[model samples]
Target: AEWESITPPVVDAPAVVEFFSFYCPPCYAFSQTMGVDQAIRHVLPQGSRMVKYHVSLLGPLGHELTRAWALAMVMKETDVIEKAFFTAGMVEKRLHSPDDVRRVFMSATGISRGEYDRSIKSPAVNDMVALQERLFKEYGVRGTPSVYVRGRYHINNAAFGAFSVENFRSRYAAVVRKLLAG
Candidate 1:
């Protein structure tokens, strides 16, 4: 009931794809609390995974942060690195340039200068950024925190017939399960 069915639904990897930005405070709030990522992961079906794209159009550091995000995901350091970014941007406002992003990544993950530098320019990071760019347009995403189920259905703020915040985790899981089942 809270989802908008896509016309001529396109096929994509069976996963929960979330388009978010660290600079967006609402995204930060979701990351801090129970989010779609957590809710879906708990009931994810076989062969499905959680995917996230960092919309890096916020400012000069947008691309850099996107690169940082991809690198952190590759290095399995998202939990730490993402929090660092949110805090730096939302609370401290210290991320103004690529250098600031690198500093935060380095300090948060304790990654060596050379490794960090090398990692950012890797093909994996490049591909991730490219995919993010492509999906952003393909999905016609217009706001932060846009979430798609299996890349076919977009979640909206419309009423969830029987859903409530108190039962969000369970209800959210059911929503996705129902989508996948359909």
Candidate 2:
């Protein structure tokens, strides 16, 4: 079906799409060690784009997490939400439920309760969430923090030969650079 509703953004520059979840400890650990935001910003080619997809592979809790991410998009506060969501979960360990997601969103972005309510139900937000799910399914994602470069190439973490977070980051950057050059 070509994943109709979800169009992976064309990569005019280097692009990295990461499938992640707030509840994944390894993802959290990797984020801390590599400073995901910083690493991407520093290493990605000029004009490169990075997209984070909070996948729903964990059953019910996944819905809440994905909804939080969708709401962030609706609010146009994705970067803020990304940092805060991860911090709340991996740093403070405070986001464990829908309420926690709401609380973190509100606390981190100061989005009003009413705005939060509206965003969660907004059609645009819902569509984005649906697209995220469709893309995740199309990609056959089985774990959190799975990364793909330039849409077609998947970064192989196991090839790094060591589990050190820095090594993973290095390998990821190397692959992304190669993809951009080719």
Candidate 3:
């Protein structure tokens, strides 16, 4: 399934963080499906907030993509960029260079290519990635499609059951809801 996934850091609600990298095939599946939002909004109890935490395992290309993701967030286009990256890497398989990354950002968000370029290189994006790095290490994230609940519970899909989208929806929600109950 797609979003049987993680994070650290601050959040007000019962946070659901999906720790994924654009290069991960599972993440690609998630992006193509009715994913993380469903796992949170449709399944988890109300008052839960889901966030995407991009992690790098595809070397420099992954790093640049995530930096772009950080900038896209600041630009208020994280959702589009996330989908763009996953689709580009998984379905299209064209995310081999920064140029491709730029094209996706501009096309998806309607942000100018130059603006996206500048933002990715800017300190703000760099700092955001840096901070997330600290938090990632703090949480000891070691896998893609890992889900962390409220920065406390890391939901293991296989342990619960194989994900069939619907299965994950109910299983993931039940885990987080149980967390909230306690």
Candidate 4:
């Protein structure tokens, strides 16, 4: 009852795609508690994978953070890094520049500045950033916090039926379920 129709073409497997920036408030809200990534994953109808994209809307900072995000994901610290950035930005008004990124992330994730620098500079991180850039373009992502089901249907606020600060949990899962069942 919570989900509307118009779900896009079927996919090889159910896949969730989220495109947002580190500085995007809505995105921060999605992970405000626990994580939308973790919550909505249970709704994967075909048992699929999910991916994240750092939107290119915010300028060089966006790109820098995108690389940082990729570094975290590659190192299997995505939630920790994102939560750290969110806390630093929302609670402390930090994250003003790339240097701040390193400082805050080190303090937040217990990763040293040198280790952070070395890991983020690795070719693997660069490859992920490049791929994200390409995939974002391919998905025609127009704004931050944009999410898609199966890379076909763009999930809207109405899908959740309540664009509140932290309602994406049920909404995303419902919409994705509709995508799979349809």
Candidate 5:
């Protein structure tokens, strides 16, 4: 099928919520291809939002990575965080332990170590974690890069039928447009 442009709903717009981890290869690959924020902006409604939740899908290390992501969210610098994290992991091939991840975030965001320490442990950050957990449960997310449209529909990546990015985009756009028109 030909790819169609999609616009999210108005009051109940379609949201593309992606549950990903920093260390996952497929997540990194998808991010690299889609240009993370750009993909979100292009596919979503004008006012719709994409919630990128970092999950601990890769064990303890994944948990630490998630915390680092939480720190970025807590400081309201997810965009910066996303870029830095991607560069550090995917480009530099750096060993991204918790401390290394924290340092990278601190350096890039100009957030002091003390501030980072405090913010990661703050109630707000904890609440965000809780909210992410709820989303995971609600969406039945099974792995990194799992996607949901309008909080009700699932984007069947496996059913692209054709193993091509255009195919996936076409299928995705169709789903989003249908949801928006309803």
Candidate 6:
């Protein structure tokens, strides 16, 4: 029952924007087992898409990871990139620098170092990186796993109250669906 309305709501195709950081533990859990993505994306109303923004100003290697995320998006290999980065950061504790991110990218996608070097600098990657940082600040995001409905309503999990793994998806989907309608 808790949501915040942004003044001058962003007008666009119906979409859900998820703000997250690679280093965030909750975000990782949300991606893997919390069923957040599967739950909402599967039932999103027609014409709506799910959008994710990686907050680049957090953690030691945040900016580097953000750039890597953009590269994956451009290369259409987010699944590989996300899993590699998450495993390295969370489980392996090996994601230390831009070079490490590059190594992971190369190993996961079998792309040459030269291609990665070139792709990282391209305008497409730069745009996504810039947008992630811009929106992170513009939305005043303080934590990972932030959800905004149509860039208008902020979903406040605190208000969701007493949810288990089983009920979470259904409850969350209903809230999102209602928000999209109104």
By TM-score, the best candidate is 6
> What RMSD, rounded to one decimal, does every model reach?
2.8, 5.1, 3.8, 3.6, 4.7, 1.9
TM-score of each: 0.82, 0.82, 0.82, 0.80, 0.80, 0.90
Scored against the true structure, residue 80 in model 1 reaches a CA lDDT of 91
Q: Which segments of candidate 4 are over 4 A away from where they belong?
A: 1-14, 33-38, 45-47, 158-160, 163-169
Q: Where is the poorest 10-residue window by lDDT in model 2? A: 1-10
lDDT of 3 by residue, 72-149 (tens): 767778777877777777778787787887888888889886777677879888887886676667667887877776
> Whose lDDT is higher: candidate 2's or candidate 4's?
2
* lDDT agreement with native, every candidate: 0.77, 0.72, 0.69, 0.71, 0.69, 0.81
RMSD in angstroms between candidate 1 and the native structure over all alpha carbons? 2.8
lDDT of 1 at 101: 90
- Count of clashing pairs, candidate 1: 0
What tens digits encode model 1's per-residue C-alpha lDDT throughout 98-148?
Answer: 889999999999999999889899999888788788778887787787777
Per-residue lDDT of 131 in model 3: 61
* Ten-residue stretch with the least lDDT total in model 5: 1-10
| 70 Cα displacement, candidate 4 (Å) | 1.2
lDDT of 4 by residue, 1-182 (tens): 24222344435523777887867777777767536666766776554777776765675577788888888778877767877888877677877888987887677678877788898889999888887887777666677777777766777754455455355576666666777565
Supply the TM-score for candidate 4.
0.80
Candidate 1, TM-score vs. the true structure? Answer: 0.82
Error of 4 at 138 (Å): 0.8
Candidate 1: segments with Cα more than 4 A from true spot: 34-36, 158-174
lDDT of 6: 0.81
Task: Give the true-structure RMSD of model 4.
Answer: 3.6
TM-score winner, 2 or 5: 2
Report the C-alpha lDDT of model 5 over 2-106, residue by residue, as the tens digit.
222223322242366778887777677667664433544576667777778988766547767777777677778888888788788878977446788788888
**Candidate 3 lowest-lDDT run of ten:** 1-10
